[PDB]
């Protein structure tokens, strides 16, 4: 399928500025799934890796998962979730998210034949829409990938691999619960640095960026440094066995 190349009018001007601005649109979850009375963090991690796998195996676009994660949580603030149901929920999320962020959607059949009725699923999808009041789309960690590379002056020639290599790690990371407390901006920065530290690939010592990113994103250098660690950890804890 034809795949989007650069577009300076979407990759080189004051856009972090709005990404940031729009980042500040949805308040930080003080405590992940704070309102849950039956399903737990542990339950989320497990489900999230089953979703991560859903997208990776079916090759959806990179910004699908991070959005399905986003949907799921925003959804699981308002309404309540049950283990006997989580499977369904999580599946709904992806469905919506793929419809949005990906050209090749995740058909329901192909998502039920992997679990509930292909109809009770449609419902759960709907139940998520009106609940979230059709306000689904959001700022993903992923949206900062190029803009951040742009601002850091990372030479265009590498953007392809960097984007690909980092977008990947940010996705697994997103599986973990400690990461859901962080801002998409930071998570992205963390994952870039993390990734950058795997075959220099012609990039400066990750070091050099930490201070710029502090200036770029506007955070204490310490915070940047921490999130790099944090992200590189959730990236590690990825484990298919948990299923």
């Amino acid at each position: 399928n034809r795949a989007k190349i650069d577009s300076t009018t979407m990759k080189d001007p004051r856009v972090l500025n709005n990404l940031k601005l729009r980042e500040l649109l949805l308040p930080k979850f003080t405590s992940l799934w704070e309102i849950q009375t039956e399903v737990t963090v542990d339950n989320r991690t497990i489900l999230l890796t089953w979703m991560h796998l859903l997208c990776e195996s079916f090759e959806l676009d990179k910004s699908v998962f991070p959005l399905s994660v986003s949907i799921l949580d925003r959804y699981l603030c308002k309404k309540q979730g049950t283990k006997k149901t989580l499977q369904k929920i999580g599946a709904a999320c992806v469905l919506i998210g793929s419809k949005i962020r990906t050209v090749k959607p995740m058909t329901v059949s192909k998502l039920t034949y992997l679990s509930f009725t292909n109809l009770e699923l449609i419902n759960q999808e709907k139940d998520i829409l009106e609940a979230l009041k059709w306000d689904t789309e959001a700022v993903l960690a992923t949206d900062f990938l190029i803009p951040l590379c742009n601002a850091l002056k990372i030479p265009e020639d590498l953007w392809p691999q960097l984007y690909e290599a980092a977008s990947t790690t940010i996705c697994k990371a997103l599986i973990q619960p400690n990461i859901a407390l962080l801002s998409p901006g930071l998570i992205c920065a963390g994952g870039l640095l993390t990734t950058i530290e795997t075959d220099n690939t012609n990039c400066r010592p990750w070091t050099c960026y930490l201070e710029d990113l502090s200036s770029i994103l506007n955070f204490s250098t310490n915070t940047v440094r921490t999130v790099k660690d944090q992200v590189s950890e959730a990236f590690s804890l990825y484990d298919l066995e948990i299923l």
Partner: peptide
Amino acid sequence: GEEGMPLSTIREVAVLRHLET
């Protein structure tokens, strides 16, 4: 049929709801 809310009537409202503020 078997696909839930129309694929577009979503991206459509999605984007509008996002930038509405």
